[PDB]
Amino acid sequence: VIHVTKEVKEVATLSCGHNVSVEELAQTRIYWQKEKKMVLTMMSGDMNIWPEYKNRTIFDITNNLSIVILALRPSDEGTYECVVLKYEKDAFKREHLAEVTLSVKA
């Protein structure tokens, strides 16, 4: 678990720690969620996104499959778990559940 700390109202990268290839990205489902509340999904190459986090997150796939949180707020503080699944034998096999915690200093 990576306790990344970062100052308020700043671009905030959250590393998933798992590298997926762009050919494999169509067959791999990636989604981020904090405190069991969903944040963004990348289901079969579709970058769907939640209304709480539509306009302030940018997915950088190459840099450890990360989200960059723009204009970070204390409401965004918490534990983000990054979930990655791969399609095997007509079943999505979960392969990554890395948890990172973001703390807000103001």
């Binding site: 979930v83 990655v84 699944l85 079943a91 096999k93 979960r94 392969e95 559940l97």
Partner: protein, 201 residues
């Protein structure tokens, strides 16, 4: 001097939260039934096997090359047909991940031979695998959170029993498979969740 496992007892009062097993099913289960779950435990050649039958599912979970034997189990039914299984062993003598094989046979509805029979790597620390075999099409999703940090809040521990759970993130391993496009909805709503302690512990 080396720490060992004690000889087996009729009743165990020191329970260790080893695994949070959640199985989603397509057939309907309404709510928790008292006395439904019947579990059988066996510790043979350092392998702890528990076979619990309840709510139309027979779950055969085996932990391999381990120094702890199972003591108890608790099965509860959540909303949207999610079935939550809480499993308990003696104590955590060694701080290492163990290879698991969990066989989930549908015994009452959507009944058949082996459907998946594959290996789920643990997502955290990648040190163990679940050789999971499903005999039937009833199972929709399986989430096995081993050595969980958080005990389910509406699990009422039996009196004169003592619960210990792992408090380290370095020890918890999650095994997950979903057979339908469910986005891991194995996460129960937990609003109407109740837990019943199994028989033959």
């Amino acid at each position: 001097y080396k720490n060992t496992i004690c000889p087996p007892r009729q009743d165990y009062r020191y329970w260790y939260f080893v695994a949070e097993l959640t199985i989603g099913v397509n057939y309907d289960i309404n709510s928790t039934i008292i006395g439904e779950c019947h579990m059988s435990e066996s510790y043979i050649d350092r392998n702890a096997n528990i076979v619990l039958t309840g709510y139309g599912l027979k779950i055969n979970m085996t932990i391999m090359d381990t120094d702890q034997r199972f003591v108890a189990a608790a099965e509860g039914v959540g909303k949207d047909n999610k079935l939550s299984v809480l499993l308990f062993t003696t104590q955590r003598l060694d701080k290492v991940h163990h290879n698991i094989s969990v066989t989930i046979t549908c015994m009452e509805m959507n009944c058949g031979t082996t459907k998946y029979n594959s290996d789920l790597p643990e997502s955290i620390h990648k040190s163990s695998s679940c050789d999971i075999t499903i005999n039937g099409s009833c199972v929709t999703c399986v989430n096995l959170e081993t050595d969980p940090t958080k005990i389910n809040p509406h699990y009422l521990h039996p009196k004169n029993k003592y619960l210990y759970h792992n408090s380290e993130y370095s020890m918890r391993g999650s095994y997950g498979v979903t057979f339908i496009d469910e986005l891991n909805q194995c996460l129960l709503d937990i609003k109407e969740l109740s837990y019943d302690i199994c028989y033959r512990e």
